[model samples]
Target: NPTYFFTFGDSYSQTGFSASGTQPSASNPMGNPDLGIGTTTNGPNWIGYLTTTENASLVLSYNLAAGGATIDNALVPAYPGDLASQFRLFEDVYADKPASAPWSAEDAVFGVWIGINDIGNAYYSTDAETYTPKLISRLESLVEEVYKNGGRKFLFLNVPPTSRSPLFLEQGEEVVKQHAEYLSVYNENLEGMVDDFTKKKGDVTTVLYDSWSFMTKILDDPTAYGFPDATCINDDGTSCIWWDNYHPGMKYHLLQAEDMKPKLRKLGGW
Candidate 1:
């Protein structure tokens, strides 16, 4: 059987799916206006790169991510995309599948890389004592819903070090440190949520992709990862680690896809 891929998240992973009688292309599936199927960066995002470049088998991909999305629609209202609404889109599509469809729980994998906007938008407003637990609980609920819906293999990514981003750096040392600490607490909760999911649902296979480490590694040695600068300023975003004050450049997303390919292949047992 072939493997089917599904992705859910925010602008970081959005490929802009459209059903306006336009055929999905390798470079521009939804005919993304800004970058032609790219995420918030200059070139193809992680979802586009993974589905087209990393996919070695017959894989059908449906990316349901949007810009400014949150886990439970607390920080950012789901104006267009959120985790819960994305799941509903998946279910709607799945229900329309033909009886002879080749996809199944064992033949599919779901990738969820969220929480950046969740923490970023509310870090200064909400206290850690109140926000961390709520984030983790919503995350667990989403995972459970997906598991019950026949998604067996899952790839979850923790929040990266936003403190290193140009936005936070410009905010001075105090704000940067505070955001870093908030991210650390949120990531800890994420780890615990993944562990709890594993214990409760032995039939499902889940892997937490350590994006925090990945970003930090690249930041520590940009030259090793082919990045000339860790912070993107007025450049074209093609040669920098970051594309803007917050989003990463295509190079970063490309490297991330390259690193994730082997791990995803192993998890899918393909």
Candidate 2:
């Protein structure tokens, strides 16, 4: 029985972690620039829909995904913010939960969407070859660590090809192409890893949420998929369907929810 939904990843899963002016906060020491002022809403994020109404009664969703996290973040300690502390906490709870422990009632369903920030930053600063391997390693470790903590069910979300986003486009076609190539390679490895894990851990139900495939399918032939140039690319060369270069616009996220509703239902039995 799934009692909760545990989330782990980067900004894509960061519903409450970012406040518009997080750049000047004591938390972000890197002087990371804010996306804007007052963008995040007080309502549902990607997981918010699932945690409302009857869904909320059935499952509790814990979102621990931060603003900027790479696969390498897990390899490091937790002081500056990392996944290790969270993983350990869950593991310790699981060790006693099922044995009539106080928290057995809290057994959860784990949903992870990570590694994008790692690649995103790398794409912005470094080349693909230098980061793809590290990205792969980080994902592998994430899976391993989560499993060790008795996380029997896993739902993994992949990164979207960021070349189309305004952020990369701002740099011009050449840089976008470079980032796109690397993102493609990352997805390739991620798919293989999912297959490998599924085969080895049949009891541990696993599902892959293919945001990459969905985006790729639409980008290749926007009009065919109702992602017309108007809604995808704006007059000023800005992306119409994105709140920013990296995030999706409200309409697009709604469309995504519609398309993914079935897959999510199949995964959660909700």
Candidate 3:
């Protein structure tokens, strides 16, 4: 049976996909921008691997993630798009499941991997102790909006370990420690939100991927993951785990999706 994956995220997950662009077909599953054309990972991100490589069946992906999206534009200012605007685009184009991609609740899995920009943008300026909960609140509301439509299964990814990033590493231990604390607080509440959201909505099946921990594992042992080095400004997109001081390379996304197959399979999402 054919299944669909509706994804929302930022540059880490963006594939330059447009709802009105070249629709996914038998020959090219990613449709627009091709596989890795507009991705910041320097190649296919996790969504690409999950949709085409690790998938158990024919999984069509509709990615609406922008380069710098946050939970909400009002809460944390982003580039030109946010989750709110993405949903607006979804409501206008794919909410009813158009002829181009006639998806159903039983055959679709919604995925969200936001908050990297939210925390990274505001953790230093905003009072994350109080502000992050509000971000999660808005995130839950957005998910609720999807549920109101026809989404039942979802995959949520927590923010990666930005404190360990090369950019943060150069900022010295003080800034690094502070950013680490903020990230910790955000993940704590994020995990709590999933538990509570599932309890409140019995029909919903959600999986929270601790991307922070996973990235930490890769950083701890770069060789185990086949990376020549974990930290680099590897512009060529190979020989290193990171493409730049901030974003990771395509290999990281590939490995992340490969490891995620088992977790996704438990929900019949693989």
Candidate 1 residue lDDT tens string, 1-270: 456567788888877764232333444323333333446777778776776677775555667787778887754454557787787776676524434234577777788888888888877878876778887897777767767777778889889887899999999989988888988989888888888888788887778889899989999998887777677653355678888888887778888888888877755533
- Let me know the TM-score candidate 3 reaches against the reference structure: 0.96
lDDT of candidate 2 over 1-270, digit per residue (tens): 435566776655555432222322123221123222112222234555444432423554545566565555543222334454445545554334443222231245677776566656565565556556666766677668766656677778778866787677788899888777877777777777888888887766677889887767766676664555522443222245555556655445445545565676645634
Error of 3 at 135 (Å): 0.2
Expressed as tens digits, the lDDT of each residue in 1-270 for candidate 3 is: 567788888988889898878988667778787887888777888999898899887888889999888878898897768988887787888888888878777887889999888888887887777988999999899888889988888899999987877888899999988888888898989999999998998988789998988999999999888886667768556678788888888888898999899889855658
Q: What is the lDDT of residue 137 in candidate 3?
A: 92
Assess each prediction's global lDDT (C-alpha) against the native.
0.74, 0.57, 0.85
- By summed lDDT, the worst window of 10 consecutive residues in model 3 runs over 229-238
Off by over 4 Å in 1: 19-36, 74-80, 95-102
Candidate number of the best lDDT: 3
In model 2, what is the error at residue 194, expressed in angstroms? 1.1
Which sections of candidate 2 miss by over 4 Å?
17-43, 53-57, 74-79, 83-107, 124-131, 217-239
Off by over 4 Å in 3: none
All candidates' TM-scores? 0.88, 0.72, 0.96
